[PDB]
């Protein structure tokens, strides 16, 4: 059972076959089933090769009941919250179940700024490293790290660091 909000149901709730990664990219059941099975979710999982390799994705997708929580849909809209909420619960053939695991705010949300910022900075560091060698990556990260220093930097000199 996936308890979710009205926008997710409308935009990414998809039953049946998924042709390309774009389908899987925008299919809540897929993005719920894969992490349920492999403890993770990366771009590699949106691959037709990975999809076929494991028929358990669709077994679980076919077992997925989507239910709207009125609260979730309301708090999605309220300007004091802007929730984006999903509760997931897993039931077993013998009648037992996990609990219901509810996460109402994603890591990139203001309410989790404290935990998200470490991840934002690591993501910046990885992306810098696909383009610049290590010492330039260090100069760029170090400059962007210090509010007062970055603010006093001339724009032309900031753009100097990012060329080639």
């Amino acid at each position: 059972v996936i308890t979710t909000h009205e926008s997710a149901i409308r935009i990414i709730s998809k039953v049946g076959p998924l042709a390309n990664p774009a389908d899987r990219d925008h299919c809540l059941q897929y993005m719920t089933a894969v992490p349920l099975i492999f403890g993770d979710l990366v771009a590699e999982h949106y691959e037709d090769a990975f999809h076929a390799a494991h028929p358990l994705i669709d077994r679980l997708r076919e077992k997925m009941e989507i239910v709207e929580e009125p609260r979730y849909s309301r708090e999605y809209l309220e300007a004091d919250k802007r929730s984006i909420a999903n509760a997931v619960e897993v039931f077993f053939d013998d009648g037992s179940s996990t609990g219901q695991v509810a996460v109402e705010y994603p890591l990139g949300h203001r309410r989790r700024r404290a935990e998200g910022i470490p991840l934002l900075q690591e993501k910046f560091k990885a992306n810098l490293a696909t383009r610049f060698p290590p010492q330039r990556c260090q100069r760029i990260f170090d400059l962007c790290s210090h509010q007062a220093s970055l603010e006093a930097t001339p724009v032309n000199r900031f753009m100097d660091l990012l060329a080639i």
């Binding site: 060698p133 290590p134 010492q135 330039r136």
Partner: protein
């Protein structure tokens, strides 16, 4: 000289260090640059010796100081260094290039297969440099030639009357 290498590698090393400094290098970049100056190829001095002597003797230094700028630039771009470039057994500068004498192909004693120094670095050389401001002459003959210009009016007339110098 004694290992068959031209002395312009010293231009290459001195210019790598001073140019990296002017360009803002820190310690790690400057050591990287210095090590590349040393791993680099070092020109022979064939072009300073008959019967193969020629105008490369006049521009080897320019080409070495040019290479110093290029290596400093490579270090400032972030290139990693080569830390044992001198001392690495078999592959290093000392073993490959400073360990044999070229006049007779002999192997130096192990004790002389490294750079030796009688003093550190300060400002001694510039203070003590030689300028060519006198006679077009080899330096070891400058004082003899200037002695003879003074002695010239004293032996000017008695030219034929000279027996021994």
């Amino acid at each position: 000289n004694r290992v068959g290498l031209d002395h312009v590698l010293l231009v290459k090393v001195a210019s790598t260090a001073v140019c990296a400094k002017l360009m803002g290098a820190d310690r790690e970049q400057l050591l990287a640059a210095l090590s590349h100056a040393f791993v680099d190829g070092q020109a022979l001095r064939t072009y300073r010796h008959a019967p193969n002597a020629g105008s490369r003797k006049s521009w080897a230094a320019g080409d070495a100081t040019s290479r110093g700028v290029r290596l400093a630039d490579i270090a400032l771009r972030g290139e990693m260094g080569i830390p044992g470039v001198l001392s690495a057994p078999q592959w290093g500068f000392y073993d490959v290039l400073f360990s044999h004498t070229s006049k007779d192909l002999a192997t130096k004693p192990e004790d002389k297969r490294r750079f030796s120094f009688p003093q550190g670095y300060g400002s001694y050389v510039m203070e003590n440099v030689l300028f060519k401001i006198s006679f077009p002459a080899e330096f070891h003959a400058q004082t003899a030639a200037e002695a003879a210009v003074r002695l010239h009016p004293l032996v000017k007339d008695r030219l034929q009357r000279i027996s021994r110098i």
